[PDB]
Amino acid sequence: IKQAQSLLGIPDYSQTVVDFVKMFQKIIFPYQLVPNVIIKLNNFDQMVSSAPNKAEPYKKIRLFCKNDSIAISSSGIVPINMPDFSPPNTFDYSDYANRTNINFVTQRVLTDGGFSSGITVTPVKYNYYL
């Protein structure tokens, strides 16, 4: 938190965390998604987090608000009260995300950049909703 403020302008090094907390809170519903800040919270506790004690990010946050037909997970919109993703799916069929196409596009990228190293790529994936 100290470091984060440091990167920020530090008008008040003494400013309470909850300040930042609620400031971020102002935007949640309009953007319908979880701040990285709050994820690092419940990530970097020993226990009440992703829990390095046991490495349990499985404690994803399912987050809901008044009157919603839906909720915000750590990982996108979800329909209510269901286990984060149905195994049956409109699967990321491998014609997409084929190694071959991934590599081809990556080579295009590398050439275009003129970059030797440090590039990796991955397909997006989806959950209950797309």
Partner: protein, 243 residues
Amino acid sequence: CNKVRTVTEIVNSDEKIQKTYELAEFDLKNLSSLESYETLKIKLALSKYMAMLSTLEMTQPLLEIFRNKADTRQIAAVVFSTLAFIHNRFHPLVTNFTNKMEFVVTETNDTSIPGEPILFTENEGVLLCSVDRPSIVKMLSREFDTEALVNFENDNCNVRIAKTFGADFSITEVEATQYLTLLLTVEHAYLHYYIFKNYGVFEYCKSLTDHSLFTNKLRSTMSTKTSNLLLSKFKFTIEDFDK
């Protein structure tokens, strides 16, 4: 046979005593301490150079630098610093030179060269240098490395059994060891650079057609101080050239 003999006699020849000894094991202790402190000196020099490099804003581990190719800045800086250190060790006189020099990274195999990853064009109006980042990375392919090994020995009872009886940035060693690679490489390059800088392009045709003969020109030329060539064996099977 060196079985040194000793006799002592009192005034008035009242008595005479004898003993005898040998320089053996004395010579061994001498050789021991000699190699000990010389190895220490070489280690100290390595540490010195590496430390000096440490000033240069290592935002990245050494290898990352070359794994990148977008930069030329950091690379040329490091190279120039290396050449400075080498010249300083040849010349106890911190100094600066023709105050214009510059560099190129060759980047294609089809622009590479056999043997030497470095070359100088001595005065294309002014000195210039070219270097093979690809091949540098190939040297960086240090998956090569492993310590667990065993030294050759010989004749230990005479030679070695005597030696039997003696005894944040907190980065590990293997990388540092790798430094020696570019050290020795830049040494080999510096040899030709000095040579032609002092002498003819005929003897820069030579020295490159083979290195070999340049020992002659080094005669009376070397600074009377050794460099980086301690352990006297460096060879393979040879007769097996099987032409």
